[PDB]
């Protein structure tokens, strides 16, 4: 299923190319700068 928000619990490692962080968006989890 998709990822939803609470990115932190909800995303397990969320890693991205920095700069960037697991974050929230809207209800789910993306990351973000």
């Known amino acids: 299923a998709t990822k939803p928000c609470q990115s932190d619990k909800d995303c397990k490692k969320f890693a991205?190319?920095?700069p960037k962080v697991p974050?929230?968006?809207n209800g789910?989890?993306?990351c973000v700068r």
Do not use: N
Request: contains cysteine; hydrophobic residues 20%.
């Open 16 to 18: 991205c190319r920095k």
């Open 28 to 30: 789910f989890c993306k």
């Open 23 to 25: 974050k929230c968006i």
